[PDB]
């Protein structure tokens, strides 16, 4: 395939136009007075978003040379999402500023490799200073403030997130789902949800709602399918002797066992129910064992130390204070497993979690941890239309990510005030020569851009706001929503350290290396 | 397919334009002040590179007649990579210089075949003089200097490479892998890594990390799959009699043996573990025998002298002081094989290595040598993005190649100073007639180009630098990074002989033969 | 398909332009100062060649009417290659000269059929005179001179070819193969090479190189596969009784026989080896019988006079003084077959060679002859690149062809001096009428062209050189490389008769018949 090659200033010029166009497109969404973007979809209704990384990833340009810069800065935003999930617009504005200035600063005498090296040194100093500036999290009021900021100032969302974190712990499982109502709702899930329904309608004993409700039931856990009359009779005999209900959790129930169970239940009122085993593969076995410890029962049919169904004993069955079964799910509430083994299981699970990490295994392990310890919370997001629901869940997910991050790390000043306060640290650096001298001064001049961009999106002159803020004491900042100068901490306009430091480091490294180009090669367009 | 034919001066002119364009494109990356090139990729993010051969192989032009010269000089660079892996830009600059001058020198009276013959004679003299100039390697400081030069002046990379060579020997196995961290790290691998995990989770005995840790274990090596209770019982009986742990390395474990092993381990605490055999085909057998000598054990089931599992004896099992097994790998640390047989095995392996050579077999043999003698080192290259990681591993691989080459051969002056010092040798040649007289003078005028190119990339006039250097004493040279005249040896700016001599010989031979063209034929472009 | 038809002078004109263009393209490569041609390849690197027939076959033109002449004269060159493999440029220059003059000589009154008849008579006289001029070959110095001429003056190639002919005889087998080194090498193959490796690594007895080396071994030749223990035991018993090594050459070895052999070798040190039979089909049988006579053994399992393995006798096994077996090949050096049967076999083979001829059967028969009598020589051609290696093997193959031809026939003056000296013979012819008078004068004027072309390629005026040569005594000629007049025989610039006579006859007949055209029909180009 034939290709075209361009050299030097023209290539840099097209590079910078492409970067500027993409970054201008993304920048409109930033801050409390930013606006949303709609992206056309070829198969239905277009999404409406205020998400920088979404905008960046959604834009590709026909012009080949602009396309390099476009794809690189969309990747920068994508990396920001990959790591923090937020801060992406800040990363983008930093990237455009540094790339632009570098392109208009490069000269015959400059040496980009030392320039970038000095950039790396200065940014490392910046993150060091930020880490020294960080403060721990202590109050639910602070978490709620962070959540409100991340949710674009939605106090109801912030309150719901704070309540959820209180209920499920700061490391609990929170999931977002579409609502069918005008208002958002917080639903708390306790115990064990495993999405298996009743096997036979005959087992229903509660008319209102067609529910199976039993008290003080025996628990039978079978890893393998239950088939034989000889395998089933001893357990039912034990249950009838003790006059207690029985719940049978098994891989499957075969025709003969199912017919016997339903027929006996119909003709005697025998309190029995059967349900499918949850999870597939080794996951099924994991849940079965976890339930065994939780209820104080045993798992029958294990490959190691195989325990036979023919000789089931009364002490091998778990005990649960309440069981609720419906068409979609089944519930055991008050297991009777011993606390010491429960603690052993939780400890081993967290150790397994700490050894090897992947998205699937971490998700399953976290789900198990919550199920075994505290439960999970699901926030259902309501709305009149799919586009509106999507637009709000975007902000809700951003808020959740931000709150989790502010749980892992400390806080810094929001609104760019932390970055503005970081300028004195760069004045202590001593460059060995001109290339890093240029790098440090560039960083000292670029780190300020977010505040100007925020003020511009607010319709005020960022230069005047930043000058008054930097001339003010460290505890004073500018609230862009009110349009005033205030002490930021009492208003609660604060940001997590990790997001900003990651965005700065990634954007600076990537774009600063980009600024070393002299020649660009692209394929000639085909017919 | 219809084709077009052109004759003489026009064909040569287009040839030289194509060569010049490609070589100009490649030359920007050369030397300490060279810059990087980005190459568009049709399936994702574009690579950023400073690699001459990569640039050359990545460029193809639409114009048919330029394309001949383009492909020939990319091949020249490719040959340089095929042999040295470095020096490719130097080879390219030599090729362009000689090709250009030849094209603008050819005349009715010239006879290219004697011209090229004289070129070959003179270059042979040049390599002879270089080989006389070469000096052996003696110090880790010199190796570190070479590594730093090849890594584009990265002292951290040079230090890490020097430490790696110290740990694994000058002929050890070093591999490059992607990092997940901001900084590079050096990891040392001792013993035998074979990438097989534990067969059964039941065998785990260490809670923290889910590891199998055993001391003074017996080693069972089975080439074939282990199936029968009769085949397994004697070994477990021996192990229990001697009250020592057992590790079973076998092709596979069947259902009955696996169930018996896991059940016994669970019910008694019997110290047993089983793992898959590593390697496939005859490679598996090779590792099994090598482990047999290493541990002092025997291999059961061999086709020759078949040894039965039914009559296993205590002395047929290897002994190892420590074994560590985890999900991904297993480790035996302190084998008890006899040193004389270990030495016999290493000797036979190196003899096999010396008989027949191919990339796969050499790789496997080197891996075995390191595993049996000293181990292997892996350098993990960190970074914030795939493009950055790729760009740095390129330089790291170049550096590794350069250090290996400087281990095989001697050193010469870097920066082109060796080639500049080679001019007096050509003044001793006596040509028989005009065609070789022209060839020798051409070589004497072209060998100087690298220094001018280095100075030009440094932004200084190569003619003045080269003149002052050649007017200076032999031990004085110009450091392009500082921009000064210095004694090169103390600064450590030195180059391996092989790379330069190979690049010179290949470039001269190929392009000098190319300079014999009069007519070029290409196919007419299709619609 | 619609077609276009043209008549007379226009058709002849386009015919001659096409012939002239193609011939001009080819002519640049001729003689000691000719240059090379590069031909574009659509799948990789273009070949570089100095070969007239290659150039001619590689050229096709879009213009339909030129294409007839182009294809006809490429065919002429191809015929020259088909017969001689050299002389192709001379044939082409003769063809263009005669075709051109004929086209510009044809007139209303000329009768081309008698013109061509006279051409045929005169050329027949020319070959008669050449055959009278021919002289036998007597000295290795003369063969070396011929080889040097054909190799474009390469004395190293000429020396290597002369040494090869000395080692393997003037009718031995010589093959060309790619080298992996900078220099060419001559390798001599004696005995029997059949490209089969050892069946089992267990049979290896020499550590250095992993070779099977045995002395005074028995030879077992089995046409069919060896399977049964009953079939194998008697031979091994005989070998152990006589305490001599055994080599088993068989179609294949089955699992049981292979296991027994390897196990016995391992446990006793029994000197046995097994190898695959070489050749497929009846070729396998031919080699097996030939080895039977060579070693004095017998072939077991033949369809006629089937000899059983169960009753093998000590005298049925061949004897060989030394056997070397490695991974790729096996060698028996000093067979003990009776000379009278060896001579009978060689005689029958050469008689079979003389009865029926095809390329495959002749190749196999010649290979067998060399293997049974003297062995074969392989010249390995070195070089830095595939294109260079190809360019040199082309000349080497040309040289081999030329030396073989000069072994079959005599010699004449090179440089066209023989053809120049042939002019007096045509002055004795008496034409019956004008058409053959024209034919004879045309031939007398065209036969001189090669010398002018040689001088033109040398950059001197061929007319003056030819005039001085023809004015000189018969033993004096012009060396174009030095540019002087010399006695050709002492310098050794001489040519084989067959190549020149064949080229002249084919070119004259074909083009002279071509010169009888009046109308040309071609298809109208499609869309
Ligand atoms: N009312 C406010 N007053 C002052 N600063 C504010 C106010 N509201 C938000 N900010 C600041 O806006 C910045 C975040 O804006 P935004 O979320 O649009 O940028 P981003 O995180 O880069 O974009 P994205 O969410 O797509 O990654 C924070 O620094 C925050 O402190
Ligand atoms: N600071 C320096 N002063 C003087 N010479 C230097 C300096 N740094 C590097 N050089 C010289 O640059 C030359 C190598 O440059 P470079 O690696 O770009 O060329 P190349 O090896 O042909 O390219 P490639 O790595 O793609 O094969 C060496 O001769 C080296 O001595
Ligand atoms: N140094 C020389 N002096 C005089 N004549 C020479 C000299 N070298 C070669 N020749 C003559 O050149 C002629 C052969 O040239 P060349 O091989 O190029 O023609 P060709 O055989 O028709 O081409 P091809 O090899 O493609 O078939 C011979 O007649 C040879 O005697
Ligand atoms: K935003
Ligand atoms: K380079
Ligand atoms: K020729």
Residue numbers in the entry:
A (entry chain Y), B (entry chain N), C (entry chain H): 0 to 526
What is written in the article reporting this PDB entry?
Functionally, as a group I chaperonin in mitochondria, mtHsp60 forms a complex with the cochaperonin mtHsp10 (gene name: HSPE1) and serves as folding machinery by facilitating the proper folding of unfolded proteins. In addition, because mtHsp60-Hsp10 complex is the eukaryotic homolog of bacterial chaperonin, GroEL:ES, it has similar biochemical properties with GroEL:ES directing the substrate folding process using their well conserved hydrophobic residues (10–12). Mitochondrial heat shock protein 60 (mtHsp60; gene name: HSPD1) is one of the proteins whose expression level is notably increased through mtUPR yet it is the most abundant protein under basal condition within mitochondria. Because of its abundance and functional role, the mtHsp60-Hsp10 complex is considered as a crucial factor to mitigate folding stress.
To characterize the detailed in situ structural properties of the mtHsp60-Hsp10 complex under folding stress, we performed subtomogram averaging using particles extracted from stressed mitochondria. We focused primarily on the football conformation, as the half-football and bullet-like conformations were present at low abundance, yielding poorly resolved reconstructions. The structure exhibits the classical features of a football shaped group I double-ring chaperonin: 14 mtHsp60 subunits arranged in two stacked rings of seven each, capped by a heptameric mtHsp10 (10, 11, 28). The in situ structures closely resemble a previously reported in vitro cryo-EM structure of a purified mtHsp60 complex in a similar football-shaped arrangement. Our analysis suggests that, in situ, the ATP-binding sites in the Hsp60-Hsp10 complex are not fully occupied, with ~12 of the 14 nucleotide-binding pockets showing evidence of occupancy, which indicates that fully occupied nucleotide is not necessary for its function and formation of football complex. With the fitted model, we identified the extra density as potential salt bridges between residues Lys103 and Glu107, as well as Arg444 and Glu460. Under folding stress, we also observed structural asymmetry and substrate-dependent contacts involving conserved hydrophobic residues—such as Phe279, Tyr359, and Trp42—lining the inner chamber, indicating active substrate engagement. In addition, we observed extra density at the base of the chamber, primarily located in the region of the unstructured C-terminal tails (residues 523 to 547) of mtHsp60 subunits, which displays connectivity to the substrate density. Notably, folding stress led to a significant increase in the proportion of the football conformation. These results suggest that under folding stress, the mtHsp60-Hsp10 complex increases its proportion of the football conformation as a structural response to elevated levels of unfolded proteins, thereby enhancing its folding capacity.
